[PDB]
Amino acid sequence: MKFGFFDDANKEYVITVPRTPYPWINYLGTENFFSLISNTAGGYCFYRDARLRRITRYRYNNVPIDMGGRYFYIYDNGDFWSPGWSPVKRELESYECRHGLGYTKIAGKRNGIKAEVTFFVPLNYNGEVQKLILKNEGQDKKKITLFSFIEFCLWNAYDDMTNFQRNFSTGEVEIEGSVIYHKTEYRERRNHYAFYSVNAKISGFDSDRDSFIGLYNGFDAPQAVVNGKSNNSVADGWAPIASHSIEIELNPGEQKEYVFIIGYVENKDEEKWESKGVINKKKAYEMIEQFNTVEKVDKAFEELKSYWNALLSKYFLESHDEKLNRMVNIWNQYQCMVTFNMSRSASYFESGIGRGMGFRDSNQDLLGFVHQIPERARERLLDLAATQLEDGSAYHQYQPLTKKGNNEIGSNFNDDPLWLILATAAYIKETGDYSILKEQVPFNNDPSKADTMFEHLTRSFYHVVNNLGPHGLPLIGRADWNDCLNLNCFSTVPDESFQTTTSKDGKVAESVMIAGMFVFIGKDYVKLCEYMGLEEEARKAQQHIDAMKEAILKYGYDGEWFLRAYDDFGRKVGSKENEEGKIFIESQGFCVMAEIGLEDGKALKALDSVKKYLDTPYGLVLQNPAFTRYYIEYGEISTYPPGYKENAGIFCHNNAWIICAETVVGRGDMAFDYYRKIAPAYIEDVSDIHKLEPYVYAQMVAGKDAKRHGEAKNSWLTGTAAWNFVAISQWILGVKPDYDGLKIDPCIPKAWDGYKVTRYFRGSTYEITVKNPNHVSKGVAKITVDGNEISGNILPVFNDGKTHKVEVIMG
Amino acid sequence: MKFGFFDDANKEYVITVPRTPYPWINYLGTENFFSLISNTAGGYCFYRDARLRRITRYRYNNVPIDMGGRYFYIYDNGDFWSPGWSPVKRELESYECRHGLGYTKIAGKRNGIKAEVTFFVPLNYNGEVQKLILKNEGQDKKKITLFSFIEFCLWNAYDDMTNFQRNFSTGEVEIEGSVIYHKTEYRERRNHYAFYSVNAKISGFDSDRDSFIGLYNGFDAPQAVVNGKSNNSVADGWAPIASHSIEIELNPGEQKEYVFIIGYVENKDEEKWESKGVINKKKAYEMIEQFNTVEKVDKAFEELKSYWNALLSKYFLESHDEKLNRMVNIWNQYQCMVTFNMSRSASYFESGIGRGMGFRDSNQDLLGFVHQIPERARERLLDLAATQLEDGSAYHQYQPLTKKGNNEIGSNFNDDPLWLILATAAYIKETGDYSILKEQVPFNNDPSKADTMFEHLTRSFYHVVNNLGPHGLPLIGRADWNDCLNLNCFSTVPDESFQTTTSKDGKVAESVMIAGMFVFIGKDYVKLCEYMGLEEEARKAQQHIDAMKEAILKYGYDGEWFLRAYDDFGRKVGSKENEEGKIFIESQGFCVMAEIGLEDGKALKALDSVKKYLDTPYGLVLQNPAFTRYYIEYGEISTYPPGYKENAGIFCHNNAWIICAETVVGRGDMAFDYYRKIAPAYIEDVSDIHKLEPYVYAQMVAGKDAKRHGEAKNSWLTGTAAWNFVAISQWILGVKPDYDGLKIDPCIPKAWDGYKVTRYFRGSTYEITVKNPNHVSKGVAKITVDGNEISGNILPVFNDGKTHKVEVIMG
Missing domain, CATH: 2.60.420.10 (Maltose phosphorylase, domain 3)
Known part of the structure; x- marks a missing residue:
């Protein structure tokens, strides 16, 4: 069908049917409090860390899909329904969802009653504000009852979904006035609680899930909504929720307005309690009063709009x-803000449990974000550098809440350190702020091991130098940018992820992609050396770069395209000599970006090979041919069925590198063809195939070897946003x-x-x-x-x- | 106040309405393959390990509750319904679930069609058999379509619920004849697959969830069933399922019978493949062949029943x-088999993720199981001892799949080691088989460190002797039997479980409970020394016991009851001197069982104090008064709201110790009264309050301090079963x-x-x-x-x- 359209003037995507090929979401907030919200108001919110401060509960991979979120019910003489169609799923006279920049508007109408809700997170405010307008567009007087509903999470999302033997007895709430407080574990180690408030006198409420919904009922028909009145339940363990109800009368043409807020509050320890067992609400009252009128809300909504207009005007x-303008002036930049905040942590695919801020992921996001808010980019660089170890390697990701590096998704990824150099260079080029090089930065998150930001750079560069294989190419370690190229692994146990299973310190397996990166990114380190007035260091650095180039030219070129790697047996990977994986895309991009083979036609040959073997209607696949069985020597990449994920899937992220490369050899037409093929604004009419959000890039599209070729997975959170914006804005x-x-x-x-x-x-x-x-x-x-x-x-x-x-x- | 009844003749509990106060489940299997199944056929099955080999997916804390299981849909000329009512939840003419010994029988009737399904796991067989009978009890000929349905889990249940980023692209299946095979990751490291067969020609199938159900629909109305025909979908990532459909014609009074099997298969590394990409089905054919007629199914069913009659006859x-008869002769012994197999891993409360086989838990389960199958008991002891470390401490638990000890839920619980001696003694008293003392048993899962089972007991015993505090009482360590009495913790960070957060090797905090246990249990260690012909070692051990008995009287008695502990500051715990927690139940029980103060009125006084301050109509609470704020010096126990779990909850398990103790001072009337307050058969007429299964014990009943006083949590998997069986059968x-x-x-x-x-x-x-x-x-x-x-x-x-x-x- 047609599911929606772009609205450039209001900077919104408009969805016109609720049953989209997949729930289509938007992100609220840009600083500390965040929400994911779908076109039916599904989703949840959290504070800084989606694993450790999750405020509301949400079930991934649920049946039906996307059940749970911010659920308003309109009760009208026995009938009931929701503005977002779901969860009740009764036909609406009219429906519309507008996803904008930092807000989402959902509007539904049934039996003469129109309900319109604007969801957003105001600047500098720890809550999701919800302005609900209710209008009677019929001819009769209406008496209705409005219900609200959210379901709380018990803060720790992991514990929340596994530790029922304990956490079915910890749920606690307070109800006072028009506010419902979730205070689970506040009596002990937690200094924070959450609330759900409305700015009017309420007719009733509920805070216990079983009482409001009924044990054997679903979100589509909560027994309290079915009966047309709250049960005023007080939660005591099990599942705490927040629901207000408000009896309302409306004359023909009359409208009434309400402000609901999901808030987060952290108290200083000297202000924890008002009295024994009664939480100090001073800060809640302030937050709530701050938006107790529709007019206070509007002002904040406009302040947010102006904020976005400023960012985008840069x-x-x-x-x-027009399609190009729409990507460059609005959506790509918007997506870059989101990825900068979320990294790869929480979406409708990333569960917000295992992944924090990725080291290489956040470094790359900086590339497409530095111009928007240099100040925050500066600090981000300092936060990432602090998770670097003394040997120059780095924690693969850090915990958003604490910013502490951790090994929860693996270690020893030998491409990691180089990204820090690229991102620093990008920030410096953008700002001229060389002073970042002088900042004192912890190693290993250990303040006692601090050294300058430039010394972190030096150890990144030399981590490659000090780790080369038999061809003088960089050792791959556990994997490079490609998480699934595991050449030191040889795993046979089904129960351990390839990302964390033991991987030996192999001195044989090498990556031609890291070699390309090293040459490309080394350019920047040499100049930085020169700035620091270190002529000899700059000279030695340049020597290592020059030797790496000769290593690629000598041992990294297969004849018509660049090789991918050498495995632990010293065998080529990504060569015409292999049976499968004859050519990989990753090394083609970076080697040519590094300006290798520009004179002897090797670069042009490579790009032509890419076009020949990797190109499809939906983008360039990772490699060809796809692997058709498990190769113990290659690791995770061969475990995917052909055409999915790292196994010949289309990884939009690395398509950007080929776009850049085409620019290096002066083929603007081909570069733009590649850009167009994966850019949302150009491929909107195929939403039923793409399946996911038509206004943002996704990570992976099924490749030509897959039966589902053209179907995307993992939308929103991808380095495709940063890298494609760089390609289009800087290279093209x-x-x-x-x-x-x-x-x-x-x-x-x-x-x-x-x-x-x-x-x-x-x-x-x-x-x-x-x-x-x-x-x-x-x-x-x-x-x-x-x-x-x-x-x-x-x-x-x-x-x-x-x-x-x-x-x-x-x- | 009653939703079913006991059927003693058939050894069953009969449930007569589908909407029980909470789903009420049963367990199938006694060896390797296991199923959980609720009264509406909800639940799931796994092989050996519910975390690493989960076969079908199940959502805990779901809305509605308990959605997902083995779901038969009867499609009758546009109408459709389910035998268990759920998930379709259309009114039935009749409904009935009988939970029996290792089988569950569910029967629904609607619009003249009766369906009866019997679920069981046959002896020595890796699958769940489902015998389904359809009968036309109406006046006219009927054309109907029968659908079957299960949702597969991706083997690793943790990955399954967190790693969509990857696992939405790994799902794979094969369809051949009347069999659907789930083979996700079989192409790589997994040597196992599952299948769902029916012993009859089928009209259609589905293996993709989205195709069968439809994105925005629920288990209540799968689009395929609504439509009256299968879509014949072949899964490819996303969410694999197995569904058959069969068009059936029934004359009035006619009945047809079908046999469905959920099977698990493991092939040798070299026999995985029939051909390139096609799995070796040889073993599945044999398993399916084995029960392809109702005749074969009935024979195994009767063999299972003989198995159970013989077990119970001992x-x-x-x-x-007759309430006492049915507890002793049927339900208590049935539950002890279940806990022996499952420890505290997987129920409707324990998620089957974090907990494997507990060291302390499985040792206690043996007490109530040795008479049933001594041979299996003997082996369980050896597996447990293998997870003991050379210093006498033990891993707190081990992985069911591999039997390796681990620290997933904490370490350094100083009561742990002693339970091994009790259980070994119980085994020997039962069998007279002292040969077990000479078995060579590894330390730290390391065969090279092996030594005799007796030496293992010696280190258990001396671990206490080598770890005494200032008063000659045992150092508590991380915690004793009460996992939440954490006196070496002083935790302030909300993000980590008390069970695993760092805990110093404290040399001050002492447990009077471990003291009591050491005296009671040490008596067996002395007896075994004597049997080994080590009279002098028997003498030394007796000395330590006598010294501990003095230490208890000198420092462990508060004046009217026994003390609980000494905290890290040297202060008394469970004393009249304390503001809250003046008396704890645990030390009363073991000290009196240890025969301390029988002669000077101390024992009796303690027991009277227990009656006075801990007694309730629903059993004895853990301590009194309850903790009304967090005590950082006590740890997790004060984090629960009053009346729940370890904070003054009623922990049925430790009530048994009071029952035994009452027996020791010769007060049989009191002992039995306590026994009756918590025995399922004696409180069945208060099902609504208790809430959970009326035929098995539950871990915890909310205490007098809780607004939900009387309501149970964590049913089925609890030491309450073994200890109460021991109490009634042996002590009373x-x-x-x-x-x-x-x-x-x-x-x-x-x-x-x-x-x-x-x-x-x-x-x-x-x-x-x-x-x-x-x-x-x-x-x-x-x-x-x-x-x-x-x-x-x-x-x-x-x-x-x-x-x-x-x-x-x-x-």
Whole structure:
């Protein structure tokens, strides 16, 4: 069918049927409190850490899907229904969900009653605000009852779903006025509680799940809603919930407005209690009063909109392609904010249990986020560096709540350290803030082991240097960027994840992808050395880079494309000589980005091979042919059925590297073709195949070897967002931050007449108009700034708060 | 107030309405393959280990409750319903579930069609057999379609519920004939697969959940059933299922019969494949062949029943109280088999994730199981001892699948080791098989560290001696039998379980409970020293016991009851001096069982104090008064709200110790009264309050301090079963295995005229008739065996396969 459309003017995606191919979600919040909310108001929220401070409960992989969230019920003379269609699933006269930037509006109408709810998390506020408008659009007087409902989680989501032998006896609440407080374990080690409030006198409430719903009933028909009145239950263990009810009368045409808030509160220990066994509510009262009127809410809603408008205005594209404009000025940037906050932790696929902030994942997210909020990016870099060990390796991820590095999803990923150099460079190029290099940063999360940020950089670089294999290529260790390339593993026990099973310290298996990264990213470390006035170190660094290049050229090129790796037996991986996995995509991207084989045609050959063997209607697959059996020497990658995930699935993330590479060899047309094939705005009419959100990138699309080819998994949380924004904004469009200022160097489809990019950069804004009068793909003939022509492709830095005219002539 | 009834003749509990106060379950299997099944056919099955080999998926704490299991849908000309009512939940003309010994029989009737399903796991067979009978009891010919349904779990239940990121792309199945095979990850490290067969030609099938059910539908209305035909779906990732459909025609009065089997198969590494990508089904064919006619199914069913009759016949009571008869002769012994197999791993409360086989838990379960299958008992002891460390401490639990000890739920519980001595002694008293003391048993799961079972006991014993505190009482460590008495903890971080959070090797905190246990249990260690011919080691051990008995009297008695412990600061726990927790139950029980203070009125006074401060209509609470705030010096016990779990909850398990203790001071009337307050058969007429299974014991009943006083939690899996069986069968009824033979020493209510116990013991049967002409509580005046008066209270050992009549006159 048609499920919705883009609304550029209001910066929203509009969903017009509730039964989408899969629940389609949005994220609320940008700082500390977060929510996931689907087009039926399903989902949940949490504070900073989805595993350790989960506020509301949510069941993944449920039947039916996506049962649980913020459930308003309208009771009308025995009949009842919800604005989001689900959970009651009675036909609505009209339905609509608008996902916007930091908010979601869901509107439903049945039997003359229209209900419209705006969900959002205000700036600098630890709660999800919900403005509910109820209008009688019929001709008669209506007496109805409005019910609210959330189901609480017992804070620790893992304990919550396994430790019933204990936690069925720990649930505690307080009810006072129009507020329901969840205070489980507050009597002991917890200094925080949650509340659910409405800003009107209530007719009733419920806080015990069994009482409100009934043991053998579902969310579709809670016995209390069916009977048209709350039961005023007080929870005592089992399953605490929060539900208000409000009896309401409405004349024809009359509307009434309500503000519901799901809040989080942490008390100082000297302010924990009001009296014995009675929680100190001082801070709740403040939060609640802060939004006790619809007009206070509107003001915050508009403050949020202006906030987004500001962020987005830092890179503004005016072109003749509306789909492109929509990706660049809105959605890609929006998704980059989300991934920056969430990393890979919590979505409708990532369970918010096992994954925290990923080391390499968050470093890469920085690439597409640094320009939006440099301050927060700066601090993020410092937080990631602190989880680096003294030997230069790093904890593969850290706990969001504490920021402590941990090994819960494995260790010894030899590509990890390099990402820190790339992200630091990106931040420096964007800001000119070299002072970050001087910051004192813990090692191993140990303040007593601190050294400068630059010394962290030095140990990242040299972790590769000190860990090379028989070909002078970088040892792969447990895996590189590809988590599933496990060459030191040889596991036969079904019960341990490949990510954490023992992996030997093999000195044979090497990665050609890490080798490419090293050359590409090394460029940046050399310059940073030079800045630090360390000429000899810069020289030695450059030597190691030069030797790595020769190693790739000598032992890393297969003939028509770059190899992937060498396994523990010294056998090639990703060569024409293999039976399966003859060619992999990862090394093609980075080796060419590193500018290898530009002169002898090896790069062009590689990219042509990629096109030939890896290209599909839905994007470039990871490798070809797919593995058709388990290879004990390759690890997890061969455990997936053909075409799914790392086994010949389409990993959109690494498609960005090929886009970048095509730009290196000056083929703007092909680069843009690759970009178009996976960009949401261009593939919207196939939602029934893609299945997932049409307004955001996903991690994985089933490849040509899969029966479900074209079906996506794991939407929203993917490095595809950061890397595709970099590709399109810097490599194609050519507005590329550098140490000395803005480097202009587009590579576009020849047919393009031109476009305009408005770019805020280092304290002043640049209006850049690009003209392609000879219709070339790459190469700049003339640049003039403020009327005068300049020499070079590097715009000067003004920092004068003014707008500067820039004309760029392709030639 | 009643939702069923006991059927003694058929050894069943009959449930007559589907909406019980909580789902009421039964367990199938006694060897390797196990199922949990509720009164509506909810639940799941697994092989050996509910975490590592879970076959079918099940959602705990679900809404609605208990959705998912073995779901037959009868489709009748557009109407559809289920034999167990749930999940369709359309009204039935009749409904009935009988929970029997190792089978569950469920029967529904709607619109003239009756369906009856019998579920059981046959002896020596790795599958759940489901015999289904359909009958037309109406006047006209009927055309109907029968659907079957199970949802597969992805083997590893933890992964299954957390790792969608990956496991939505691994699901795989094969369909061949009338059989659906689930083979996820069989292509890689798993040598096992599951199947779902029916012994008849089918009309269609489904193996993809989304196809059978439909994204936005529930188990209540699968789109395929609504539609009256299978979609013939072949799973590919997402959520594999198994469903058959069969079009059936029934004349009036006609009945058809089908046999469905949920099977588990393991192949040798070299025999996994029939051909490339096609699984070796040879073993499945054999399993399916084995029960392809109702005739074969009925024969195994009767063999199971013979198995159970023989097990139960070894201890058989005849008395004037039929509630006591059914407890002793059927339900208590049935529960002891279940706990022996399952420890505390998997029920509707224990999630089958975090807990394997508990060290302390499985040792206690043996007490109530040795008479049933000594051979299996003997082996269980060796497995347990293998998880003991060389210093005498033990892993707190071990993985069912591999039997390796682990620390998943904490370490350094100083009561642990002693339970091994008790259980070994119990085994020997039962069998007279001292050979077990000479078995070579590993330490730390390490064969190279092996040594005799006796040496293991020696280290258990000396672990206490080598770990005493300032008063000569045993250092408590992380905790004693009470997992929540954590005195070396001082925890402030809410994110980690008290069970696993760091706990110092404290040298001050002491347990009077472990002291009591050490005296009581140490008596057996002395007896075994003597048997090993080590009179001097027996002397030394007796010294330590006598020294401990002095320490208890000098520092463990508060004046009117025994103290509980000393905290890390040297302060008394469970003393009149304390503000809360002035008296604890645990130390009263073991100290009196240890025979401390029988002569000076201390024992009796303690027991009277127990009656006065801990007694309730629902059993004895853990301590009094309850803790009304968190005591950081006490740990987890004060984290529960008052009246629940270890904070003044009624822990039925420790009530048995009070029952035994009452028996020791000769108060049989009090002992039996306590026994009756918690025995399922005696409170059946208060099912609504108790809430859980009315036919088995539960771990915990909310205490007088709780608003839910009387409501149980954590049914089925609890040491309450073994300890209460021991209490009634041995300490009250007086039939007590001893080293040299059966000891007869009843302590009963004075009013009883007598009773008869038929006991099978060391190769002979004894018919013991007890007579009470003077109406005493305790004291045997005369015994005759085979018509001849014997002296003393120990029956001779015959081992002659004959029946010997024994008459006991109390006086």
